Amino acid sequence: MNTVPFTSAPIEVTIGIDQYSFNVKENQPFHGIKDIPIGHVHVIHFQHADNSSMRYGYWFDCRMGNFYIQYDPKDGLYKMMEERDGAKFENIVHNFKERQMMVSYPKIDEDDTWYNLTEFVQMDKIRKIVRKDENQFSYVDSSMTTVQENELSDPAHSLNYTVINFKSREAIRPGHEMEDFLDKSYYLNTVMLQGIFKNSSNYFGELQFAFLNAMFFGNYGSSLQWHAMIELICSSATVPKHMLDKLDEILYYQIKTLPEQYSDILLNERVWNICLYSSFQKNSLHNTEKIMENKYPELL
Amino acid sequence: GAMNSSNYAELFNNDIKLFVDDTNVYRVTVHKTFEGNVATKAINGCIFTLNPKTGHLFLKIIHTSVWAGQKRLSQLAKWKTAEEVSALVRSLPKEEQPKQIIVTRKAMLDPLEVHMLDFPNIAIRPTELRLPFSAAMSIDKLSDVVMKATEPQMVLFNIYDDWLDRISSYTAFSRLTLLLRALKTNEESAKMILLSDPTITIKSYHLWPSFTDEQWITIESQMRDLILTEYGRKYNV
The missing domain is CATH 2.60.34.20 (Substrate Binding Domain Of DNAk; Chain A, domain 1)
Incomplete structure (x- = not known):
């Protein structure tokens, strides 16, 4: 202690x-x-x-x-x-x-x-x-702004989150334009997991850190990063089963801990509706869907 | 951002640009099966890609073979349109490549942006204009080359014939949009207006008849009348 x-x-x-x-x-x-x-x-x-x-x-x-x-x-x-x-x-x-x-x-x-x-x-x-x-x-x-926010201005005071951009050459293989845009599995599994994070634990660590910076400091770029990391998994047809089960737990505790009065500014309607109701993983996030429906049915 | 009534003269400036219309790429007839279910049969389609300044039309014919064994065709049609426009741009010399591409339908933005990632300096834009390019298949010579195609083919036309010898690109585009709007609203009536007088013919190397400056004013008036009549009917006003 x-x-x-x-x-x-x-x-x-x-x-x-x-x-x-x-x-x-x-x-x-x-x-x-x-x-x-x-x-x-x-x-x-x-x-x-x-x-x-x-x-x-x-x-x-x-x-x-x-x-x-x-x-x-x-x-x-x-x-x-x-x-x-x-x-x-x-x-x-x-x-x-x-x-x-x-x-x-x-x-x-x-x-x-x-x-x-x-x-x-x-x-x-x-x-x-x-x-x-x-x-x-x-x-x-x-x-504090993110490296991504700065690209779109003092680099020493930046948040160096991993840059995620669904319409980037990093995300889209030449000749697999439609396949890779509609199914982000290659971007998630090859570029991000195998390539940059090395494992799902590092990817989840950055996702959890972005959430906590969004909640505790109302840091807007952190909130963008948290949503992008959730969307990259939900928009992938092929995700390891252990990753989906763990994501469901991570998001459940994040939604449970969020102050009720900040759901308007800290939750992105489009991303959450897409993730829970339209995405490949629409049926893989049971705990998260149940807490979101019971705590924030207006957003959905 | 969006191309509108406010920024219309921008179409006729010296920055190379193309309109892309995907409305005739995926075409079907709907029919009954022996068992009384409904089925579609695809027919030949086309990408309509037009330089509004020069009148140069890059008609890419989409043969029905491209759909064989594919799923979600209305979705694929947007991506195939984007692939073929991206292939056309790469085939043009650098000094002929467009600075902007304007899509007639907002659903083409993401597919075209993703196919053109290699060209960050080419702007992809929507328009608020309601352009009648769907009626391109009411132009007999364009309809004929699409329906006869037995394989994927690109055919090059000037959609203004020789008009630019006598009028500006603003006036030529205005004439084209009026002819296509008429053909879209009442095809039979529009075609009657364009051919009625048998002494005025279409040159073998043209799409439209060889009207004198005075005959074009009469034609343009007949097309405006056709469009307003039909409008009164549509809306009971």
């Missing part, structure tokens, strides 16, 4: 840790989050009370170092930093815990929600999508 201490909370801010969130008052004696489950990536995230614009946050894994948060009054945000002195860090955390100045990561024992949302997400893959190699943790916010 690992800890992310905070130096202080000088500005009023809503703090998120994974799917949970807490309101902190300006200069409230808050010194961080304890009992964080080892074995998963986590995201700590922030929305200032005085500017509900720019949700921003840090992906991290406590196995990869000792991380803390400190407010920077110049750049005006909560920053993640690594503490390289193990004995200083253990002594900081022990003091804050003794003074009970930390909130406890509030996991219910029965509750597999976070595991289910991050099953295939690995920090090493996050750090290739979000490039800042001097840090072991990754910064994301509301406004």
Whole structure:
């Protein structure tokens, strides 16, 4: 059970840790989050009370170092930093815990929600999508654009999601124009799975990471990437049976976790209607179709 | 984006462009089977690909053999149209290749875009214009070469005959669209108007009769009258 201490909370801010969130008052004696489950990536995230614009946050894994948060009054945000002195860090955390100045990561024992949302997400893959190699943790916010968005403008602050484009030479083999456009199986299985991701676990990890960036930061390019990865599978006649069964589970927990009030902006009508009712896999996503029909029948 | 009434003069500028109409590619007669079910029998079709500036028509004849053993033919017809237009472009010298292709039906956009990925500089555009190119098979010489074809064939025509010697490409296109609109609304009446006077013939190397400038004004008037009569009928107004 690992800890992310905070130096202080000088500005009023809503703090998120994974799917949970807490309101902190300006200069409230808050010194961080304890009992964080080892074995998963986590995201700590922030929305200032005085500017509900720019949700921003840090992906991290406590196995990869000792991380803390400190407010920077110049750049005006909560920053993640690594503490390289193990004995200083253990002594900081022990003091804050003794003074009970930390909130406890509030996991219910029965509750597999976070595991289910991050099953295939690995920090090493996050750090290739979000490039800042001097840090072991990754910064994301509301406004960051994707490599794809930038092509259609500061490359250092980009989300390097795998580019998917159904009307690209990558997607369409010369002489198989109709076959490859109407059945995306070659693009999914040869180009993307065998070629770029190497395995379905990497493909699902990027899909889950795009979803979580869309939900937690309202990052629009992330939402595009999540829909494109779903559509590439649903539009393929030939998908391994284990991939369809696992996709059904992934999407079920994503739709279950989405706030009810954000379904208008975070779900693409065309993609979901096509995936559940017109696509090759219209009958392969039983759990997802049942939760979508019972929770969002207006969208469909 | 979309070609409309607003940007009509763009058709007659010096940027090479082609209209593609796929409405006569997949043609069928519907009939009863011995058992009283319904069946289709395909007939020869054609891609109508036209330079509106020059009048140059690339008529690709679609022989019924191309459908043998294929499924979902109305869907395949769009992709075969896209394959054949892409093959035509690649066959033209670089300086003859179009900068734009305008499809008369929006369902041709994705098939043509995917076949032309190798040509990122050629714009594929829809139109809001309701062009009467479906009536191309009412032109006797074009109907004759399609129905006689025993194999896939490309035939080259000038759909304006020698009109451009006397009129601009705007006026020639306006005459063509009026003739095709008449043929589409009432084929028998339109054909009667065009041939009635036996002294005016069609040259062996032409599609339409050899009308003087005055005779074209009379013809154009007779076609407008035909189109308005039919319209009153259609709509009881």
